[PDB]
Design an enzyme around this catalytic site. Sequence first.
Site, PDB file in Angstrom:
ATOM      1  N   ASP B  25      55.957  46.916  42.225  1.00  0.00           N
ATOM      2  CA  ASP B  25      54.934  45.886  42.122  1.00  0.00           C
ATOM      3  C   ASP B  25      54.240  45.877  40.760  1.00  0.00           C
ATOM      4  O   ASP B  25      53.260  46.655  40.537  1.00  0.00           O
ATOM      5  CB  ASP B  25      53.953  46.069  43.261  1.00  0.00           C
ATOM      6  N   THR B  26      54.715  45.066  39.802  1.00  0.00           N
ATOM      7  CA  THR B  26      54.131  45.074  38.436  1.00  0.00           C
ATOM      8  C   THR B  26      52.730  44.475  38.428  1.00  0.00           C
ATOM      9  O   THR B  26      52.016  44.703  37.422  1.00  0.00           O
ATOM     10  CB  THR B  26      55.042  44.331  37.468  1.00  0.00           C
ATOM     11  N   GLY B  27      52.313  43.783  39.481  1.00  0.00           N
ATOM     12  CA  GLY B  27      50.956  43.281  39.599  1.00  0.00           C
ATOM     13  C   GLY B  27      49.967  44.269  40.213  1.00  0.00           C
ATOM     14  O   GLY B  27      48.794  43.888  40.360  1.00  0.00           O
TER      15      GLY B  27
HETATM   16  C1  LIG Z   1      49.648  43.116  47.554  1.00  0.00           C
HETATM   17  C2  LIG Z   1      51.127  42.543  47.225  1.00  0.00           C
HETATM   18  C3  LIG Z   1      52.235  42.883  48.301  1.00  0.00           C
HETATM   19  C4  LIG Z   1      51.074  41.007  47.160  1.00  0.00           C
HETATM   20  N1  LIG Z   1      50.080  40.558  46.056  1.00  0.00           N
HETATM   21  C5  LIG Z   1      50.600  40.577  44.641  1.00  0.00           C
HETATM   22  C6  LIG Z   1      50.059  41.875  43.987  1.00  0.00           C
HETATM   23  O1  LIG Z   1      50.803  42.155  42.786  1.00  0.00           O
HETATM   24  C7  LIG Z   1      48.554  41.720  43.751  1.00  0.00           C
HETATM   25  C8  LIG Z   1      48.187  40.693  42.526  1.00  0.00           C
HETATM   26  C9  LIG Z   1      46.636  40.796  42.318  1.00  0.00           C
HETATM   27  C10 LIG Z   1      46.036  41.579  41.266  1.00  0.00           C
HETATM   28  C11 LIG Z   1      44.652  41.722  41.139  1.00  0.00           C
HETATM   29  C12 LIG Z   1      43.848  41.143  42.053  1.00  0.00           C
HETATM   30  C13 LIG Z   1      44.398  40.430  43.075  1.00  0.00           C
HETATM   31  F1  LIG Z   1      43.656  39.838  43.974  1.00  0.00           F
HETATM   32  C14 LIG Z   1      45.727  40.223  43.254  1.00  0.00           C
HETATM   33  N2  LIG Z   1      48.015  43.061  43.350  1.00  0.00           N
HETATM   34  C15 LIG Z   1      46.903  43.601  43.936  1.00  0.00           C
HETATM   35  O2  LIG Z   1      46.313  43.155  44.957  1.00  0.00           O
HETATM   36  O3  LIG Z   1      46.493  44.773  43.362  1.00  0.00           O
HETATM   37  C16 LIG Z   1      45.162  45.265  43.686  1.00  0.00           C
HETATM   38  C17 LIG Z   1      45.189  46.789  44.215  1.00  0.00           C
HETATM   39  C18 LIG Z   1      46.369  47.634  43.409  1.00  0.00           C
HETATM   40  O4  LIG Z   1      45.732  48.307  42.264  1.00  0.00           O
HETATM   41  C19 LIG Z   1      44.781  47.426  41.450  1.00  0.00           C
HETATM   42  O5  LIG Z   1      45.567  46.518  40.791  1.00  0.00           O
HETATM   43  C20 LIG Z   1      45.022  45.200  41.076  1.00  0.00           C
HETATM   44  C21 LIG Z   1      44.296  45.256  42.415  1.00  0.00           C
HETATM   45  C22 LIG Z   1      43.709  46.601  42.337  1.00  0.00           C
HETATM   46  C23 LIG Z   1      43.772  47.155  43.903  1.00  0.00           C
HETATM   47  S1  LIG Z   1      49.143  39.200  46.381  1.00  0.00           S
HETATM   48  O6  LIG Z   1      48.378  38.833  45.147  1.00  0.00           O
HETATM   49  O7  LIG Z   1      48.335  39.539  47.560  1.00  0.00           O
HETATM   50  C24 LIG Z   1      50.152  37.907  46.679  1.00  0.00           C
HETATM   51  C25 LIG Z   1      50.773  37.175  45.651  1.00  0.00           C
HETATM   52  C26 LIG Z   1      51.707  36.177  45.976  1.00  0.00           C
HETATM   53  C27 LIG Z   1      52.040  35.902  47.293  1.00  0.00           C
HETATM   54  N3  LIG Z   1      52.906  34.925  47.779  1.00  0.00           N
HETATM   55  C28 LIG Z   1      53.047  34.882  49.151  1.00  0.00           C
HETATM   56  N4  LIG Z   1      53.882  34.051  49.801  1.00  0.00           N
HETATM   57  C29 LIG Z   1      54.250  34.148  51.276  1.00  0.00           C
HETATM   58  C30 LIG Z   1      54.601  35.414  51.978  1.00  0.00           C
HETATM   59  C31 LIG Z   1      55.736  34.590  51.620  1.00  0.00           C
HETATM   60  S2  LIG Z   1      52.019  36.069  49.928  1.00  0.00           S
HETATM   61  C32 LIG Z   1      51.420  36.679  48.269  1.00  0.00           C
HETATM   62  C33 LIG Z   1      50.485  37.657  48.000  1.00  0.00           C
END
Ligand SMILES: CC(C)CN(C[C@@H](O)[C@H](Cc1cccc(F)c1)NC(=O)O[C@H]1[C@H]2CO[C@H]3OC[C@@H]1[C@H]3C2)S(=O)(=O)c1ccc2nc(NC3CC3)sc2c1
Lengths: 99, 99
Positions: B25-27
Amino acid sequence: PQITLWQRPIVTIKVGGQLREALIDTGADDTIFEEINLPGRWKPKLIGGIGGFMKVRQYDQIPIEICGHQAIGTVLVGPTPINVIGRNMLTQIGCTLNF
Amino acid sequence: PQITLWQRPIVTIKVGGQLREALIDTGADDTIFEEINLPGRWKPKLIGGIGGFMKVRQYDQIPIEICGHQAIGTVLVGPTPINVIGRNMLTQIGCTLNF
Ligand SMILES: CC(C)CN(C[C@@H](O)[C@H](Cc1cccc(F)c1)NC(=O)O[C@H]1[C@H]2CO[C@H]3OC[C@@H]1[C@H]3C2)S(=O)(=O)c1ccc2nc(NC3CC3)sc2c1
């Protein structure tokens, strides 16, 4: 380019005629922006992440430029803490992981 | 290996003597697992994602094996919908993005 992971992998985007920065996010299935204004019809969608769910607007067939590469696809608009480029767009620009 | 993004980039992990799967997970800045049992002292931490925040336990200097590569670092434990390997660990295994 190649991008290492010592810092967040943030790149420059053009979407809807507007310029933004976004995180290259291999853990995101979909692409999400806050505070863009896209044209045309949309459908409400609930999506899940850590800490629960989020209501977004779903826009389809939106052109985007990601670090100079062209793609078209679904963009979600809603209150994400950071703009994210997900796999729906990353596959179109030939992005891979390598170790 | 090289991993494309047509599917979620899920790999096999060993952590705390237990076997799990996790998303590259690069995010994610940090590494988060649900339902692992790690030894020793921990500190409560609140972290933010889409949909709000999450309470986790923070464990430091935890050994992990990620698709056969060794790393050591902070692991967070709490109710994530999917286990994620974040940049704190990915930098140690030489993971890069490329397009
Ligand atoms: C949690 C993962 C699995 C998914 N997420 C992508 C992650 O990379 C997120 C990006 C991020 C960063 C910072 C703040 C954020 F609010 C969000 N990183 C993240 O929360 O990190 C957190 C956690 C790790 O350490 C630190 O680093 C940043 C922050 C802090 C504590 S998501 O944004 O929820 C998402 C994106 C697209 C998407 N498309 C979908 N489509 C349907 C299902 C088919 S569902 C769905 C859900």
